[PDB]
Symmetry: C3
Subunit: 109 residues, 3 copies
Amino acid sequence: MKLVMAIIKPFKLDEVREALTSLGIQGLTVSEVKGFGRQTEIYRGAEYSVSFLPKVKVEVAVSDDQYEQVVEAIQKAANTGRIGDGKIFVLDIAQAVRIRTGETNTEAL
Amino acid sequence: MKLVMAIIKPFKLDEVREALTSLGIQGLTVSEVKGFGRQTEIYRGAEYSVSFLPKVKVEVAVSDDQYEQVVEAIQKAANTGRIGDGKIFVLDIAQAVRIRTGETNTEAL
Amino acid sequence: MKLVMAIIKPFKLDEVREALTSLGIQGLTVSEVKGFGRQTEIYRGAEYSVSFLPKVKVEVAVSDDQYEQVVEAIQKAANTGRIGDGKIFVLDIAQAVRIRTGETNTEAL
Ligand SMILES: Nc1ncnc2c1ncn2[C@@H]1O[C@H](COP(=O)(O)OP(=O)(O)O)[C@@H](O)[C@H]1O
Ligand SMILES: Nc1ncnc2c1ncn2[C@@H]1O[C@H](COP(=O)(O)OP(=O)(O)O)[C@@H](O)[C@H]1O
Ligand SMILES: Nc1ncnc2c1ncn2[C@@H]1O[C@H](COP(=O)(O)OP(=O)(O)O)[C@@H](O)[C@H]1O
């Protein structure tokens, strides 16, 4: 099992969701985040960040047989070719549980 | 060390916290998230998500000796038996640091 | 590759960003979170959390050659020596992709 974590432009969320649904992946968790990457105001000694780049973090747990296709689908849907498109990170999941049923691992996803 | 990540119904957060406290686990980090799983409006070409399912993400770093009990306690407390109860994912933590002291690994948790 | 996840006091975010920039790390993702660690109101049977400790979660993907220095820089910048300074967790990243280009792994970071 893998956790696919994507940081994308907020306006690409619906396209990414659609691409994942077409793969049979409809369960995902979305977080609002602030990005720093490629305005500040100096107040009482230090530089203070006064503007931020909004991004969306998409997290989806998927099987080892699914993860490569999921990464590909997110990359293709979230791409603009312009700066700030974001990143996809894949991490290993050791164990999973479906809270409603107690089902575990692949059967929980 | 393990990172236990649970996505739960917001109204179950206090019950989950209480269950973890009873185990001697009081340190945890909570994020507000949006869930997609088991309303849209069509505007200028595409389907736009106009409603979301609020969920809470609970993240707690725990020792290898603790994680199984923690997963069990969260599952039991967050369960309703109804759709949308959520998921628990366990991931491996390679290293941990307590910022205040520089303590590492188990002694940081 | 490693994902360095730090939970810090919100007023330390700019100092942490500056320390990371000095290392040549400018890409990071920040989340607003609620902390529980070291007020409640009883309503209709149960204890309800009515106050929360705001924290910031900093997530930065870095190379195996960089991660130790990154952990050190965050710890030093975020430290006050007072309760609540927070935690740093390091997790393994299996794969990474830059959405704009399709670049992978170290070249994506
Ligand atoms: N190494 C990293 N770790 C964590 N988040 C990152 C990293 N690099 C980029 N990000 C996230 O991706 C966003 C885009 O990064 P940026 O360098 O601006 O564009 P690009 O990915 O096209 O080079 C950032 O705003 C940040 O949220
Ligand atoms: N594979 C997954 N990856 C990430 N988050 C998920 C996944 N499946 C479910 N979730 C999260 O759990 C919530 C509940 O999922 P859902 O399928 O609606 O109910 P159930 O878990 O009872 O089948 C979703 O709203 C989403 O936040
Ligand atoms: N085991 C843990 N897992 C996840 N988050 C934690 C853990 N311990 C602490 N935290 C986060 O770090 C914050 C500070 O923890 P606390 O125990 O209050 O102070 P200190 O880290 O100085 O002992 C908490 O509010 C919470 O957000």
